[PDB]
Amino acid sequence: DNSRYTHFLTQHYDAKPQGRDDRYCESIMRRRGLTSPCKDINTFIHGNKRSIKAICENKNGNPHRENLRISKSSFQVTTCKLHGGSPWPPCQYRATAGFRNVVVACENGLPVHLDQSIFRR
């Protein structure tokens, strides 16, 4: 099984978003099915899928806290934060474009969870 890996990618991977504005967040949250109810905060990693998997092995990661891993590389990311309001569509989102290392949980050398706490801030 890799269902938790492809689910991590649907929820937290966007290869090349072009524009990382409010409208982009509002669009992608709908496409990835995170608007029923409106997810309060969600982060998309950009760039190569290769380098995100490599976080699970010592090449591109370290141990972090209890169950997690933090990346050695920095990643282009966009955080989408809910304005208002209602936990029900329509969901408006504020986009914050960042560049830093990511915290994930790994299993079978694949990321299966993103720690959103480092992007709440």
Residue nearest to ligand [N] (CB): 113
Strands 41-45 and 61-64 come out as unpaired
Q: Is 30 in the site for ligand [N] (CB under 6 A)?
A: no
83 is catalytic: no
User: Is 80 annotated as a binding-site member?
Assistant: yes
Report whether 34 contacts 11 (CB < 8 A).
yes
**Closest alpha carbon to 12 in 60, 40, 70, 52:** 52
| Cβ distance to Pt ion smaller for residue 61 or 111 | 111
Neighbours of 15 (CB within 10 A): 11
Binding-site partner at residue 64 among ligand [N], Pt ion, none, CB < 5 to 8 Å by type: none
Instruction: By CB under 6 A, tell whether 45 contacts ligand [N].
Output: no
| Host H or E run for residue 90 | none
**Residue 12 annotated among the catalytic residues of the structure:** yes
113 forms part of the interface with ligand [N] (CB under 6 A) = yes
Give me the catalytic one of 7, 46, 64, 113: 113
Interface with ligand [N], residue 114, by CB under 6 A: yes
Q: Are the C-beta atoms of 46 and 78 separated by less than 8 Å?
A: yes
Q: Pull the structure tokens for residue 83.
A: 């304005």
Q: Is 21 annotated to bind ligand?
A: yes
**Six-digit token string for 17:** 């978003």
Q: Which residues are annotated as a binding site for tRNA?
A: 20-21, 80, 102
Residues that bind Pt ion (CB under 5 A): 113
List the catalytic residues. 12, 113
